[PDB]
Amino acid sequence: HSHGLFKKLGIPGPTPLPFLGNILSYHKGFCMFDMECHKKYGKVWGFYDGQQPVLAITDPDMIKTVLVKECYSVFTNRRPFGPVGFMKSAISIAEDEEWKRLRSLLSPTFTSGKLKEMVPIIAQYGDVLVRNLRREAETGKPVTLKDVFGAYSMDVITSTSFGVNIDSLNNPQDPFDPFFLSITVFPFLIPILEVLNICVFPREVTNFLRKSVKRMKESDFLQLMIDSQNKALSDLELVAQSIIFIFAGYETTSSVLSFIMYELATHPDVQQKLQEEIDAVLPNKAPPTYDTVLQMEYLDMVVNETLRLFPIAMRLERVCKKDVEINGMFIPKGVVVMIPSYALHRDPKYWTEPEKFLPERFSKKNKDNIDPYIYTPFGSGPRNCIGMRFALMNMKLALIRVLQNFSFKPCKETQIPLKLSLGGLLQPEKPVVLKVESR
Amino acid sequence: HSHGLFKKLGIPGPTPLPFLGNILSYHKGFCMFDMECHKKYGKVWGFYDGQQPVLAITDPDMIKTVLVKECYSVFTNRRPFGPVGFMKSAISIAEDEEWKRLRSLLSPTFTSGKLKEMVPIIAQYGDVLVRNLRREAETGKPVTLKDVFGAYSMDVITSTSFGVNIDSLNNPQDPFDPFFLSITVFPFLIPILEVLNICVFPREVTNFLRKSVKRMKESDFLQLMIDSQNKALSDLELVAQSIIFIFAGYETTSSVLSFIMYELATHPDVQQKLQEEIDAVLPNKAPPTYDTVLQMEYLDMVVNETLRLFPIAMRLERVCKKDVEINGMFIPKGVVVMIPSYALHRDPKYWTEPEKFLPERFSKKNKDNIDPYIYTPFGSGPRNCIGMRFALMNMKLALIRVLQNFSFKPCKETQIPLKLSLGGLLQPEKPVVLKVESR
Ligand code: HEM
Ligand code: HEM
Ligand SMILES: CC(C)(C)OC(=O)N[C@H](CSC[C@@H](Nc1ccccc1)C(=O)NCc1cccnc1)Cc1ccccc1
Numbered sequence: 097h098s099h100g101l102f103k104k105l106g107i108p109g110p111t112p113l114p115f116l117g118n119i120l121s122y123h124k125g126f127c128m129f130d131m132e133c134h135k136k137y138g139k140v141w142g143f144y145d146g147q148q149p150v151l152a153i154t155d156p157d158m159i160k161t162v163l164v165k166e167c168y169s170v171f172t173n174r175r176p177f178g179p180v181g182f183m184k185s186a187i188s189i190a191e192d193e194e195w196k197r198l199r200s201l202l203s204p205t206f207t208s209g210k211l212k213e214m215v216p217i218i219a220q221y222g223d224v225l226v227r228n229l230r231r232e233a234e235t236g237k238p239v240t241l242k243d244v245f246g247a248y249s250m251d252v253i254t255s256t257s258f259g260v261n262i263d264s265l266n267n268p269q270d271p272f273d274p275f276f277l278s279i280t281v282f283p284f285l286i287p288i289l290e291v292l293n294i295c296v297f298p299r300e301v302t303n304f305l306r307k308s309v310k311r312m313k314e315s316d317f318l319q320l321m322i323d324s325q326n327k328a329l330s331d332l333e334l335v336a337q338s339i340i341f342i343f344a345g346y347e348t349t350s351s352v353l354s355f356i357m358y359e360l361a362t363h364p365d366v367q368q369k370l371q372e373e374i375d376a377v378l379p380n381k382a383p384p385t386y387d388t389v390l391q392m393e394y395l396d397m398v399v400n401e402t403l404r405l406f407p408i409a410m411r412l413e414r415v416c417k418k419d420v421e422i423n424g425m426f427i428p429k430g431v432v433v434m435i436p437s438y439a440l441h442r443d444p445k446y447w448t449e450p451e452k453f454l455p456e457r458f459s460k461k462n463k464d465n466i467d468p469y470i471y472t473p474f475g476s477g478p479r480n481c482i483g484m485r486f487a488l489m490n491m492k493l494a495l496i497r498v499l500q501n502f503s504f505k506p507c508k509e510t511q512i513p514l515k516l517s518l519g520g521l522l523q524p525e526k527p528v529v530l531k532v533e534s535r
Numbered sequence: 536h537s538h539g540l541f542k543k544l545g546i547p548g549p550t551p552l553p554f555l556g557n558i559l560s561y562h563k564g565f566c567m568f569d570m571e572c573h574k575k576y577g578k579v580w581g582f583y584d585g586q587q588p589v590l591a592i593t594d595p596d597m598i599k600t601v602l603v604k605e606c607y608s609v610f611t612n613r614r615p616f617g618p619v620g621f622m623k624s625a626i627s628i629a630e631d632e633e634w635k636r637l638r639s640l641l642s643p644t645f646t647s648g649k650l651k652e653m654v655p656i657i658a659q660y661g662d663v664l665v666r667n668l669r670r671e672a673e674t675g676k677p678v679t680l681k682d683v684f685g686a687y688s689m690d691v692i693t694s695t696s697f698g699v700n701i702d703s704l705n706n707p708q709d710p711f712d713p714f715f716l717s718i719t720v721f722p723f724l725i726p727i728l729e730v731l732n733i734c735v736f737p738r739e740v741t742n743f744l745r746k747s748v749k750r751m752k753e754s755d756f757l758q759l760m761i762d763s764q765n766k767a768l769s770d771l772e773l774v775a776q777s778i779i780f781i782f783a784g785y786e787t788t789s790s791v792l793s794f795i796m797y798e799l800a801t802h803p804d805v806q807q808k809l810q811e812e813i814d815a816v817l818p819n820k821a822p823p824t825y826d827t828v829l830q831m832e833y834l835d836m837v838v839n840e841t842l843r844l845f846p847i848a849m850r851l852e853r854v855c856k857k858d859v860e861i862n863g864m865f866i867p868k869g870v871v872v873m874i875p876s877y878a879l880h881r882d883p884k885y886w887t888e889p890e891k892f893l894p895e896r897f898s899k900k901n902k903d904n905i906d907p908y909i910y911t912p913f914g915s916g917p918r919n920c921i922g923m924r925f926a927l928m929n930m931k932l933a934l935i936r937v938l939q940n941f942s943f944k945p946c947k948e949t950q951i952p953l954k955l956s957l958g959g960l961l962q963p964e965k966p967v968v969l970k971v972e973s974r
């Protein structure tokens with residue numbers, strides 16, 4: 097390279113192979129690679145995704161500098177992603193000024209008031225979620241959580257943002273490590289693939305929407321995007337935000353729900369202690385409300401501690417858009433700065449027994465011993481997760497309604513312990529199946 | 536180029552643009568381009584798909600030389616197709632020796648005896664095809680032919696080759712001009728896309744089968760591929776033939792059926808004259824049989840004359856694998872030789888009133904005035920359509936059973952006349968909808 101950079105900076109790290117960089121080390125997944133490098137190299141280290149240098153940082157102050165103090169000036173954008181096509185205008189993917197604009201356009205969607213307007217609406221699909229669960233529990237047949245969870249998550253996302261109601265067991269649309277591997281050795285092929293219309297998003301899954309958002313409709317977040325469009329928001333740019341929002345609210349929601357239900361099943365005392373709180377705040381199986389959801393502290397602790405063990409983003413990243421010297425360390429233009437959330441969430445130098453599910457970690461007696469720059473399931477700074485309050489609410493409303501009616505036990509075919517997918521993303525190897533018993 | 540070749544051979548043709556070749560001329564579709572060049576240039580002409588020279592030939596003798604006399608020696612293979620992936624081992628796509636082998640392996644599937652074994656089996660889905668039609672005709676609601684036709688075509692293909700029965704209105708699997716355009720200017724990008732696993736066949740449609748043929752099953756054409764495997768046939772090569780066969784039997788069958796039913800609807804005398812023959816050969820709505828299907832001469836004439844107007848392959852092609860001088864014309868190595876079937880099927884120098892639907896053209900009084908090297912809906916020579924006798928049978932069995940119960944009239948929203956898709960393939964612009972009346 098270009099494989100001399102960290103050598104030259106005196107920054108330690110795994111020796112890269114030509115072209116490949118360190119990427120063969122991903123044979124155990126991002127997260128094990130990160131954990132290993134943390135323990136081998138300490139607070140800071142560098143590696144190469146192909147020819148791209150990545151600096152991992154683990155100092156809280158330095159992380160606050162990157163995500164917060166110097167965001168607009170230096171660390172505004174994430175690693176180039178391609179080929180994306182018209183999805184370049186998607187907010188999680190857009191850069192500099194354009195992202196600032198979309199962030200401004202879309203921010204007022206998750207105010208405490210717009211959220212609070214959605215609790216009445218969400219309250220309907222929880223009842224479908226239960227009734228669907230009530231059938232596969234009267235029939236003692238183990239249940240695939242992500243199926244009925246994603247169906248619920250799908251139902252919430254299409255109607256909180258657009259207005260479309262579907263009982264996701266008609267199986268309505270749904271979209272979807274062989275190839276992104278070739279990206280990292282061949283990032284030069286991204287501009288190639290762009291001119292080919294080639295997309296990591298199959299052109300058919302997007303064409304299903306390239307009209308279906310125009311096919312919505314029309315005369316909620318979709319409302320809020322024309323009402324704020326009234327330098328304003330295009331319509332192929334509006335479709336792009338819709339795609340982001342539908343994915344995020346479907347996949348992350350369903351998947352974190354599956355993780356929580358696994359933890360409750362292998363820790364029955366935590367499941368019961370939570371069911372008792374729900375019944376004390378919502379007695380007679382009372383319907384949750386925006387304000388009772390926010391009152392349940394143990395539900396929050398359970399949500400948080402699961403997100404400690406399964407930070408589904410895994411890593412946070414920012415591109416260095418110019419030479420800087422943050423907290424005494426020189427960082428050259430073009431380096432990707434990465435925060436290894438999975439690794440920091442499991443660091444024994446911050447967390448007692450860091451692999452155990454222990455929600456007391458987030459008790460108000462203990463929540464202050466926790467550095468918001470070590471615990472980052474939603475990122476931080478101006479580019480943190482815009483859907484955070486919606487996600488926590490949506491999940492908690494789901495959990496409340498579900499633990500109000502059912503208990504969850506392991507099955508013969510439950511994977512205990514749970515292996516993580518040694519692949520690209522943060523999911524289990526085998527899917528989560530548990531016995532569901534009616535209260 | 537390389538854009539001097541035809542200039543140098545004294546062969547006439549449209550002047551190519553740099554890089555693009557003649558490809559902007561496709562703005563009206565292959566078929567109009569071919570027809571135009573035929574009338575402008577005569578019997579032989581050349582053009583460039585990007586930098587690739589294509590020689591069109593229209594002399595019957597020369598066409599017989601190419602497709603028949605010199606097939607194994609010179610004109611064994613079709614234009615390189617990519618990126619294909621494991622689909623390179625598919626018979627329509629494979630080359631030289633390997634194609635010879637697969638052609639030998641797979642040929643005995645459509646013997647008159649293996650076909651005859653399938654008439655009993657096919658006879659079941661025709662009855663589903665009718666009963667499905669009987670519902671949308673008791674409800675005077677116009678019908679989309681290709682929907683119920685493809686459902687039938689799907690049902691026939693999965694069970695004639697594997698053994699799987701599905702009432703294709705549960706909507707069972709089904710797989711599927713933006714990008715192949717970039718191929719022709721960038722064929723150099725094909726080896727690029729191969730190393731990227733990138734496929735013109737979405738990796739998910741094939742993964743749905745990359746196991747589903749292994750998921751078939753196992754302890755018919757699928758039978759005949761292990762029984763002949765017993766230099767033998769692999770299993771990822773077996774999947775590849777399955778994919779070819781499922782497509783061909785689904786899409787071509789459904790689409791030619793739609794074309795025939797359009798012609799019968801806009802020519803009611805032909806529809807009646809056919810219904811009379813079916814009732815004379817199969818009286819009391821008798822079930823068709825292998826031998827009665829072959830007896831109906833007007834049904835054959837109707838099938839043939841539709842295939843004259845809609846040759847769904849459009850063009851036949853062979854790569855020149857070495858310098859030759861066929862019928863007095865020198866052809867250099869690497870040129871694609873193309874036979875413009877659509878253009879020859881509509882040549883007024885061979886066909887009276889060539890745009891009219893006139894099935895008498897194929898009467899036994901007139902069928903001999905027709906050059907099998909001008910009329911080529913199934914290609915010709917050792918690389919002709921291997922599924923021809925199956926296709927004609929399958930369609931004719933469908934037509935018999937359907938015209939035995941229903942008549943077909945135009946609708947308010949029937950496109951008359953029918954526009955062809957000015958796009959890539961030979962399909963109508965709008966889909967075919969007709970009124971269906973119960974006899
Ligand atoms: C449990 C659920 C979720 C988790 C753990 C999560 C986590 C994250 C993380 C870690 C980031 C990157 C933050 C950073 O770089 O500092 C992010 C960004 C983002 N998230 Fe989420 N997320 C969740 C659900 C959602 C939902 C439901 C939406 C709804 C639209 C959403 C929308 C976004 C967007 C648009 C971004 C990019 C923000 C920007 O660049 O301005 N997320 N999320
Ligand atoms: C109305 C229906 C069909 C029409 C008009 C049609 C037409 C054609 C044509 C024009 C060719 C190229 C011949 C050449 O280059 O000389 C071809 C090849 C082929 N057809 Fe069909 N076809 C039909 C249905 C089918 C079906 C149902 C199958 C079932 C598997 C099939 C299998 C194939 C294969 C495998 C090839 C490549 C043959 C080889 O290279 O050895 N076709 N077809
Ligand atoms: C393993 C998971 C998936 C859990 O995580 C990731 O691997 N991470 C993503 C990789 S896909 C980029 C894009 N997906 C997309 C998906 C479909 C059609 C177009 C686009 C995205 O931005 N999605 C929003 C999001 C996802 C998750 C949480 N919240 C918000 C990168 C990313 C994550 C978070 C914020 C920004 C970017």
Ligand SMILES: CC(C)(C)OC(=O)N[C@H](CSC[C@@H](Nc1ccccc1)C(=O)NCc1cccnc1)Cc1ccccc1
Nearest residue numbers: 622627628736778779782783786787847848920959960961
């Ligand atoms: C407009 C139409 C489609 C009617 O026609 C074409 O454009 N023609 C094809 C282009 S796709 C090559 C491949 N499809 C495929 C489709 C899906 C998964 C993998 C592969 C093929 O070979 N199919 C068999 C076939 C199709 C039609 C008739 N009979 C047999 C080229 C071709 C045609 C005929 C023989 C060989 C090659």
